[PDB]
Amino acid sequence: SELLLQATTALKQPKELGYYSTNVGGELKVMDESNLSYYYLPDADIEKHIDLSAGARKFQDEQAEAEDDTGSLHGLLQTLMEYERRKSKKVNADIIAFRGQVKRLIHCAFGGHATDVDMYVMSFDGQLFIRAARKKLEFPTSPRESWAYLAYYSGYKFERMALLDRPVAETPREVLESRGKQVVRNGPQYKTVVRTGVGEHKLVLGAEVDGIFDFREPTGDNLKHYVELKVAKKVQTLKDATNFEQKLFSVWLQCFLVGINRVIIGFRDEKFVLKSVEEFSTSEIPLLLNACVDAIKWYGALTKWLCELPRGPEDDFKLYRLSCSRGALHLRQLHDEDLANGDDIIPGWFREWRRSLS
């Protein structure tokens, strides 16, 4: 099947189903907020001219050095199982995926690289499970003082300088006075798991969350308290403005998909010094920027298209490659027994869980 990249539709309010904390090296803690950080970046720290390139040489990159399947649904599925177990009921949804993959599908109609839409779709138990085909991320391999390396590292340094492991009230003075000494890491992650929808279809999406902005509600839905952080170059030219608009569009997509309302941008100069930080509401972004309106209509279209795939009992473990080329998304059914029978897309333990649940 194909769907051409060129229909009015409404969004459902996303609801948080659960969350989990992970790291490379096999750490997975389901329904556990250990790795959830808290925003804290006083103006007095910013006024001292934070160098976002500081520490690039001494950085120990956990993600880059791990051999791990970055597309795996295993953490998401373990969290979903725990949610379903507590409820005694299969989640009501059509598609289960990571937010980043759905973002890629949306973005490929609006400037994204067609070449790297590469996903597996598997039907199981009335639902579609979608994962990135590739198992390894691309990390910059240029020297650490290269622009490409600093662009990558600066994101993590900004997070370490703007975030705390716990609320400010629970943080010792020693840490608050010496933010630049704290070790920069990209291993620990915290993800939310959200039920969302567009048009008449529903999705469960996993999504990385950078932190809590204001406070957390221990017994509530925290989507409204989450914040995503991004580093952008301060705008001083046409070229900078265009790059920033594209970054704004991208972070808007990331937040809107899972009901996050808060974005913080760290503006850097050409020397990677943080110049200022600005809060944006997710809703502010389309106003500032019809790409956003059309992206939601495209989201609706592509989701309705995927949901045409057969999802009855006889379709269990059928597998399709999802791609983008010649101005269209494409679905091609595969016949790969090991890949379909192995644990790479839907692991045996989750199959067993859903069977028992039936």
Numbering used by the authors: 5 to 10, 14 to 296, 303 to 371
The article reads:
The rms distance is 0.62 Å for AgRai1, and small changes for helix αF (containing motif V) and other regions are visible, although these changes are unlikely to seriously affect RNA binding. The structures of the AgRai1 and CaRai1 free enzymes will not be described further here. AgRai1 has the strongest decapping and exonuclease activities in our assays. The αC helix is absent in AgRai1 but contains more than four turns in CaRai1 and SsRai1, which also have a longer αD helix. The results also consistently show that AgRai1 has the strongest activities in the buffer conditions tested.
Rai1 homologs share several highly conserved sequence motifs, and our structural studies show that they are located in the active site region, mediating the binding of the divalent metal ions and/or the RNA. We have found substantial variations in the activity profiles of the Rai1 homologs, and discovered that some of them possess a new 5′ triphosphonucleotide hydrolase (TPH) activity. The overall structures of CaRai1, AgRai1 and SsRai1 are similar to those of SpRai1 (16), KlDxo1 (18), and MmDXO. Each structure contains two mixed β-sheets that are surrounded by α-helices.
